[PDB]
Amino acid sequence: TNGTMMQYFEWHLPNDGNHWNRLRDDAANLKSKGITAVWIPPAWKGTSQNDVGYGAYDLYDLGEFNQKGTVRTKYGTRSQLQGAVTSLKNNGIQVYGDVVMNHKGGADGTEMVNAVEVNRSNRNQEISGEYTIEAWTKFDFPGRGNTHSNFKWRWYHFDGTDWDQSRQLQNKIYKFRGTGKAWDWEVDIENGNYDYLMYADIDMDHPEVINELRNWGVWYTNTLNLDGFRIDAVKHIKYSYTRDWLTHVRNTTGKPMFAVAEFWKNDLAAIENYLNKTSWNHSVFDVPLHYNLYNASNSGGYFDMRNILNGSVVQKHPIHAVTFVDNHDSQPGEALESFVQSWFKPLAYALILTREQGYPSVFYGDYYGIPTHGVPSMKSKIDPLLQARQTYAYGTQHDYFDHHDIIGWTREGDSSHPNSGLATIMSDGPGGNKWMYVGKHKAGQVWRDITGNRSGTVTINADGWGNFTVNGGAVSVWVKQ
Ligand SMILES: [Ca+2]
Ligand SMILES: [Ca+2]
Ligand SMILES: [Ca+2]
Ligand code: NA
């Protein structure tokens, strides 16, 4: 069956502690709509209750201990989280947990550390001599104590920080001194070594760090019975470390543990180098395709639809790419904002859901909407597309990316899925028609538009060709009536 995951969260979810409860009660529904895997938001304690989770204070606190002014995380308690995972599991849905290992924020205390300032545009270059700063690198976890783990963090487990409590100076990046201290290598090259990003940067070359995060990885997997991971900020993390961390977890638990890393860079060559350096042992989000979809939706129809897949990861690396329309990085208001316009969104979803290449992901923000930024729920338009993927998107595929506005592709379906086979067509401009081959053995069949956009039927001729139609700025997916 065609796998389909769902990012079950967006950046502006309410801080009401009922998100795990919602996931729990949505499990049965998700299963019926075709979702086979769910990527849950950071389940640990952030810098505050409000934290989306990427602040990453305590990875062993899943809304179980009183820390950072709260017991529950933004999403709920450990109990409520476990209830959600159980619900998904009982409904046959896999669970992918988010993983944040690049840094830690909200240190319990400070430490005086010898450091040097570095060029923020070239972290390889030091711009100050050595001197002592007060850095937030002490993590004792008073609320948790040693429950689950007695590992405590100190300055030497980090490579640097961006804040000196003593001399509160802005626009600074500090690199810690010490034997062997240096920015980790084989990370993105923007700003000449993008090891540092925010908060206290974790030293991926320190032996205790390597062993500890690996131990945490397995504890995390076993505690929540995870089936996979969504790995955060991989371009800022030692490439070989991530590769080996994953292998360690797979080796220890014995589970395949699917994993998709977010290497956020609209650069195919950079992502390909990342896959190479990680020995292709996990997939990556197709960020390049995201920008293609964004640009097409932003072109008022002037985008050349023939090249919508050009430069994407899924075009050259189909089984190592997780395709997506939007996510918390691109939604309205965020730094990397590049939200795919709603008029084009159904087309984008048809692109990633009805084609054979890539592992598609549905964005919670798109499905249930983003109330805070006026983005309406588009499940009514996505549900039919998920239906098409679930029962009709199978078999040999034929592509027709031969027109600047109207493009499409077909699937001949296969014996393993009854009535399977489809023909999606879309136009980022005026509507029209296109003759497409769905298979001679389908001769005589009468197809209909599962999206409901076009109300008539299309009959496949004796040669297996059908003249499919589509409306302006829309998509139609024809299937056996
Ligand atoms: Ca280092
Ligand atoms: Ca880093
Ligand atoms: Ca066009
Ligand atoms: Na580092």
Q: Which CATH number goes with the domain that contains 464?
A: 2.60.40.1180
User: For residue 153, how far is its CA from the centre of ligand 2 (angstroms)?
Assistant: 16
Report how far ligand 4's centroid is from the alpha carbon of 467 (Å): 57
In SS3 terms, the chain reads as: CCCCEEECCCCCCCCCCCHHHHHHHHHHHHHHHCCCEEEECCCCECCCCCCCCCCCCECCCCCCCCECCECCECCECHHHHHHHHHHHHHCCCEEEEEECCCEECCCCEEEEEEEEEEECCEEEEECCCCEEEEEEEEECCCCCCCCCCCCCECHHHEEEECCCCCCCCCCCCEEECCCCCCCCCCCCCCCCCCCCCCCEEECCCCHHHHHHHHHHHHHHHHHHCCCEEEECCHHHCCHHHHHHHHHHHHHHHCCCCEEEECCCCCCHHHHHHHHHHCCCCCEEECHHHHHHHHHHHHCCCCCCHHHCCCCCHHHHCHHHEECECCCCCCCCCCCCCCCCCCCCHHHHHHHHHCCCCCCCEEEHHHHCCEHHHCECCCHHHHHHHHHHHHHCCCCCEEEECCCCCEEEEEECCCCCCCCCCEEEEEECCCCEEEEEECCHHHCCCEEEECCCCCCCEEECCCCCEEEEEECCCEEEEEEEC
* Same domain for 453 and 405: yes
**Do 266 and 317 lie in a common domain?**
yes
Determine if residue 157 is labeled as part of a ligand binding site. no
For residues 443 and 464, membership in a common domain is answered with yes
Spatial distance between the Cα atoms of 422 and 78, rounded to a whole number of angstroms: 43
Q: What contacts 352, CB < 8 A, 6 or more positions away?
A: 289, 323, 324, 325, 358, 360, 361
User: Ligand 1 centre from 204 Cα, in Å?
Assistant: 6
**What method was applied to determine this entry?**
X-ray
Q: How far is CA 87 from CA 95, 221, 227, 376, in A?
A: 11, 17, 14, 27
Straight-line distance from the first to the last Cα atom of the chain, in angstroms, rounded to the nearest whole number? 21
Could you tell me how far CA 398 lies from the centroid of its own chain? 28
- The answer to the question of whether 366 is labelled as a binding residue is no
Point out the domain boundary residue: 150, 173, 206: 206
Strands 422-427 and 406-411: antiparallel
**How far is ligand 1, taken at its centre, from the CA of residue 199, in Å?**
15
Residue 56 is assigned to a ligand binding site = no
Contact (CB, 8 A) for 305 and 407: yes
Q: Is 248 marked within a binding site?
A: no
Question: How many domains does one find in the chain?
Answer: 3
Residue 308 and residue 368 in one domain:
yes
Pick the ligand that lies closest to the CA of residue 205. Answer: 1
Distance CA 472, CA 266 (A): 29
Please answer whether residues 75 and 98 qualify as being in contact, where contact means their C-beta atoms are separated by less than 8 angstroms.
Answer: no
| Bridge pairing between strands 94-99 and 228-231 | parallel
The CATH number of residue 196's host domain is 2.40.30.140
Do 155 and 201 lie in one domain? The reply is yes
Q: Among all ligands shown, which has an atom nearest to the Cα of 407?
A: 3
Give catalytic residues, as residue numbers.
Answer: 232, 262
Which bound ligand lies closest to the C-alpha atom of 202?
A: 4
Which residue segment(s) compose the domain that 400 sits in?
395-481
Residue 326 is labelled as binding a ligand: no
Residue 182 CA, ligand 4 centroid: distance in Å: 8
Cα→Cα distances 254→221, 247, 250, Å: 11, 10, 5
Nearest C-alpha neighbor of 366 from the set 357, 376, 351: 376
Helices 239-253 and 207-224 pack at an angle, to 10 degrees, of 40
Other CB atoms within 10 A of residue 59 CB: 24
Partners of 400 in the beta sheet? 408
8 Å CB contact between 326 and 360 = no
Shared domain check, 109 and 92 = no
Q: Identify the domain boundary among 183, 206, 229.
A: 206
- How would you classify residue 275: left for phi > 0, otherwise alpha for psi between -120 and 50, otherwise beta? alpha
- 414 annotated as a binding-site residue: no
Same domain, 420 and 454: yes
Residues 94-132 as b/e (b if ≥16 CB within 10 A, e otherwise) read: bbbbbbbbbbbbbbbebbebebbbbeeeebeeeeeeeee
- Measure 203 CA to ligand 1 centroid, in angstroms: 4
**Which residue, of 359, 394, 429, is where some domain finishes?**
394
Do 197 and 212 share a domain, yes or no?
A: no
Residues 271 and 381 in one domain: yes
Question: Is there a single domain that holds both residue 83 and residue 106?
Answer: no
Neighbour-count burial for 370-387, b at 16+ CB within 10 Å, e otherwise: beeeebeebeebbbbbbb
2 and 109 share one domain: no
Does 302 lie in the same domain as 161?
no
Of the bound ligands, which one is closest to the alpha carbon of residue 304? Answer: 3
Q: Could you tell me which of 23, 16, 66 has the C-alpha nearest to residue 41?
A: 23
